[PDB]
Design a protein around this ligand. Structure first.
Ligand SMILES: O=C1CC(CC(=O)Nc2ccc(Cl)cc2Cl)=NC(=O)N1
Length: 134
């Protein structure tokens, strides 16, 4: 086993707060914000050796990243930013930093009770998205 095991499985979105405002801060345009904010994604997290895979499946888009902790990779986000991403495991929290155009956003994923809580931060603006097991 791995500590990273508490994240493995299939998760469904149960609540969102401030996601439109987070997307505005990131620079997402109107139409994409409207359709992406309507989405009710599933997150599917799996581990195979050192490689972690995070898939997001919804009616808006299906995305998949695979990565090794601490090792930078290029990511095309669902809103079509070309970013440089690094994901680390800090005190039990997956911390995902995306860099592009001199900007930065951080997405933290953590286990809290039976939920997986995703916190997305762009300067002063935080969105909190709560998932539970499917
Ligand atoms: O693993 C995650 C990551 C995340 C941030 C995100 O989804 N960003 C994003 C997604 C689509 C679009 Cl159009 C624009 C942006 Cl900023 N929220 C989540 O519930 N789970």
């Amino acid at each position: 086993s791995h500590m990273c095991d508490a994240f493995v499985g299939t998760w469904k979105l149960v609540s969102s707060e401030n996601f439109d405002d987070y997307m505005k801060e990131v620079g997402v345009g109107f139409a994409t914000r409207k359709v992406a904010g309507m989405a009710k994604p599933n997150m599917i997290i799996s581990v195979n050796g050192d490689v972690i895979t995070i898939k997001s499946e919804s009616t808006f888009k299906n995305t998949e990243i695979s990565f090794i902790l601490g090792q930078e990779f290029d990511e095309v986000t669902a809103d079509d930013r070309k970013v440089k991403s690094t994901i680390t495991l800090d005190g039990g929290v997956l911390v995902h930093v995306q860099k592009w155009d001199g900007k930065s956003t951080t997405i933290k994923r953590k286990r809290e009770d039976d939920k997986l809580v995703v916190e997305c931060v762009m300067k002063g603006v935080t969105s909190t998205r709560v998932y539970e097991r499917a």
